Structure formats: structure tokens, C-alpha cells
Amino acid sequence: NLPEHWTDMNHQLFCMVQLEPGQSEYNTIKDKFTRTCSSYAIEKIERIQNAFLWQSYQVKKRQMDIKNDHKNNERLLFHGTDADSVPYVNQHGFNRSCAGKNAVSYGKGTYFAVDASYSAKDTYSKPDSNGRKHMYVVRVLTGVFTKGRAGLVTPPPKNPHNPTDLFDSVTNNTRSPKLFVVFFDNQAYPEYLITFTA
Amino acid sequence: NLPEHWTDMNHQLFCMVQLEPGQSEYNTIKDKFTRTCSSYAIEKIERIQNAFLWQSYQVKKRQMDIKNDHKNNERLLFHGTDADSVPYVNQHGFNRSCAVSYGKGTYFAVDASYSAKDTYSKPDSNGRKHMYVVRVLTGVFTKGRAGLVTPPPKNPHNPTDLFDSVTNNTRSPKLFVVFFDNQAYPEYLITFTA
Ligand SMILES: CC(C)c1ccc2c(c1)sc1nncn12
């Protein structure tokens, strides 16, 4: 079920594809980024073609579309990280067991930002030895969500008398969400890597 | 593509099906257990029919069959747990975030005797103990150590091409640890007593 606009990979399981400015695909990501980080400049945007991460993510999405019936389960969010993590995330995606304690913690999980400006902080997108900062644009299965709490290792139950029927994610604020936390593998697909500088 | 031996679910996605004592599937699973736990009394064996856990596991199985270029990635192991964790496992499988001497993942035993210790299959009020029979994608494995968050790389030259699991002993393993969701399918739950 590999998407048809992807480059042919030739029995290869993984590829980074450099986007060209002037293409809609580049321009949409640049605009989404510059909306809140117009003081930074983009070096490049690579499309992540990871067949295994894509398949496992698309199965979880189909399962959430079935379970939630007629919700928008998928959001496009940002994740800033250090240069040393980029190879791991490219191949293996987002791993809660590697995740940093956020400065405002709404659970022990992987954090995603609504605004590029949050991910562009040096604490998340740590500038490398050449001043390159790195930020992923991520399809994230936010599903049905609630306000989190620092102690969560999984999302909380919707109903305390049914402890195993869970929210899909948590947020900082249900009325104006600016971040989301997810507690399961293959709930996030890293779609694009933005490399940028001051 | 839900397996032959599963029974009809009336368009449901989860159910626990109690096995008929003395029939083939029950005898197969009983024998695996009694090989090392013949002093314990089996009260029941339930088949876990979780369509979503099964789909996610099968996808990861096919990926590891392609990755490793052979089809010997799967082992049938035991997991003992407390009664308060059984409903989560039936619905969501194994979660590393819930000793951890060989790394921070989920532990599976080769022998039911290991999982039958009270420290894993904790007796509830009436002395009932709980053990899963689990399909585990052990794949290519290496010796683990404390504080692993994923398995090590096969070559430190290529740090993202990892082992699939770790063990206590590569030559004669008695336990495996997996660090990813959907590398284990809980296939049968054994309710038993000392
Ligand atoms: C001593 C330690 C490595 C260990 C920890 C947990 C565990 C086992 C062994 S065997 C088993 N079956 N279910 C759980 N566990």
C-alpha cells in the first residue's frame, strides 16, 4: 500500500527524498513552518520514505478510524530533536523509552507541537556542530484526547469503571491544544525532516 | 485474515474463548505447560481473539521475515502476571512502560516453571495464578544487559540495524526481552493454582 507519489525505491525499504522549492509539497511545509518561525531559514526538506514505519502506522490508523467512527484521528505536528537521534527516528520512528522529560510534563511519552516555534527551541532542535537545527513534520494519531498529567505511562481511561478503554492521546489544553503526547509505537509517522539555521 | 482455529465473533474484534478440555487445541497448550508445571492444577485455558493485536503482530512478523531473509523469527514463550494486569494485556498486549537485568522491555520464559514463580504469576485472593502463552518475534538475538532501552546494533559501524531481541544466554536461552509494541501476541491465558 506504498503511496504512488513516492519515488521508486527498487526493492529498498528506506529513502530520504530532497524536495524542490516551487513544488506545492515543499511550499506547504515551508509555509506551515514559517507561520511561527519566520526568523529561521530552511536549508532543505527531505520526504521520509520508510516502508515498514508507513505500513505499521497505516494499520494503527485504520484501527483508530474503525474504533472511533467518523473522527479526524490524524494531525500534522512538529518534533524537534538532536542530530544524534535523526538516524534512529528516520529508520525506527518515535520511541517513548528515549523521550526527554518536557519542561511542562503531561505524561511520559513522545511530545509533538502544533506550532513549529515550540519545536524550534534549542532544548528540542539542538543546533549541531555546524549550527544545523532539525525538526520532523509528523502524521500523529491524536484520536480522541484529554488533558494529561505528569504520571501517565499510557493515556488515561475515558471511564474509571472501564480502565482498559483509553483516550488515544493527551494534550496540554483540550480547548486550545498546542502539544500532544502519545504512548505507543507506530502512532506517529515521521513524514518530513526540515534542516534549518538562524 | 483471522486464523482458521479462531471461532466466529459475531462481527466483534475482541473475545476470550474458553477451550473445551480434552480436545486437540486444549491438549496441545496443556502439554506445553505440564512439560515443567505438572504439579499445578489447570482451572481453564482461554484463546485470546484480538483482531487488532493480531493484525499489528502479523505486519511486524512479515517485516521481520523480509528483514532477516528466513522465516524462523517466532517462538512460543510464557509470561506470568498479576490478575490486575490481565484485562490490559488481553486488550492491548505487552507494554514495556508498565527486575530488568537484561534491559527495559517485556520478559518471556522458555519454560512455564519460570513464569509460574509467584513474583510474576502473583496468586490473587483465592490463590489463582495467571500465565500467557505468547507468540514472540525473537528473530536474531544477542545477550542483553541492564539499562538497554532497545536491543543493541548487530554492527556498531551501522548503529540502526539492530538485533530483534536479547536473551540471558545465546547458546541455551531461558528468557527473551522485546522492546517494541506488537512483537508479542498473547495467544492463550492459563488460569491455574499451586
Ligand atoms: C529474573 C528476570 C530476568 C525475570 C523477570 C521477569 C520474568 C522472568 C525473569 S521469567 C518471566 N515470565 N514472566 C515474567 N518474567
UniProtKB/Swiss-Prot annotation, chain B:
Subcellular localization(s) per the UniProt record: Nucleus
PARP catalytic domain mapped to chain residues: 2-194
Domain of life the protein comes from: Eukaryota
Effect of residue 120 to C: Reduces catalytic activity 20-fold. Abolishes activity
Transmembrane segments: none
Functional note: Mono-ADP-ribosyltransferase that mediates mono-ADP-ribosylation of target proteins. Acts as a negative regulator of transcription.
Family affiliation: Belongs to the ARTD/PARP family.
Protein name (database record): Protein mono-ADP-ribosyltransferase PARP15
Organism encoding this protein: Homo sapiens
Gene transcribed to yield this protein: PARP15
